[PDB]
C-alpha cells in the first residue's frame, strides 16, 4: 500500500547470476516506506520470490 | 526530480525537531518557573517563620 518515488535504474550487459549461470537482463525499481511492519512482510515477500 | 519530495520529508522532520526543541525549551522554562515559585513560597514561609519568632520572643 506504498505510494512513495521510484528510484529507477537499468543494468545493462548482465554479469551471469552468481550461483547459477544466467546471464539475464536485470534492473532496479526502488521505493522506501516507513512502516517496521512493511520492513518485516514486503522484505520477507521479496525473499519468497 | 523525486528528491523534492524526499526534502519534503526532510522539512517536515526538521519543523517536528524545532518543535521537540521547542518543547524542551518548555520543560526548562517550566523547571524554571518551578524554581522561582518555590523559592517564592519559601521566602515568605521564612519571613513568617521571622516574624513569628520575633513576636513570640
Keep these: 500500500r506504498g505510494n512513495v518515488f521510484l528510484r529507477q535504474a537499468e543494468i545493462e550487459n548482465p554479469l551471469e547470476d552468481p550461483v547459477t549461470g544466467d546471464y539475464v537482463h536485470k534492473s532496479v525499481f526502488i521505493i522506501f516506506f516507513q512502516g517496521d511492519q512493511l520492513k518485516n512482510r514486503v522484505k520477507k515477500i521479496c525473499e519468497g520470490f | ?57
Design chain 2, 1 to 57: 526530480s523525486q528528491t523534492q519530495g524526499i526534502q519534503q520529508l526532510l522539512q517536515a522532520e526538521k519543523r517536528a525537531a524545532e518543535k521537540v526543541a521547542d518543547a524542551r525549551k518548555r520543560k526548562a522554562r517550566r523547571l524554571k518557573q518551578a524554581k522561582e515559585e518555590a523559592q517564592m513560597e519559601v521566602e515568605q514561609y521564612r519571613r513568617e517563620r521571622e516574624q513569628e519568632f520575633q513576636s513570640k520572643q
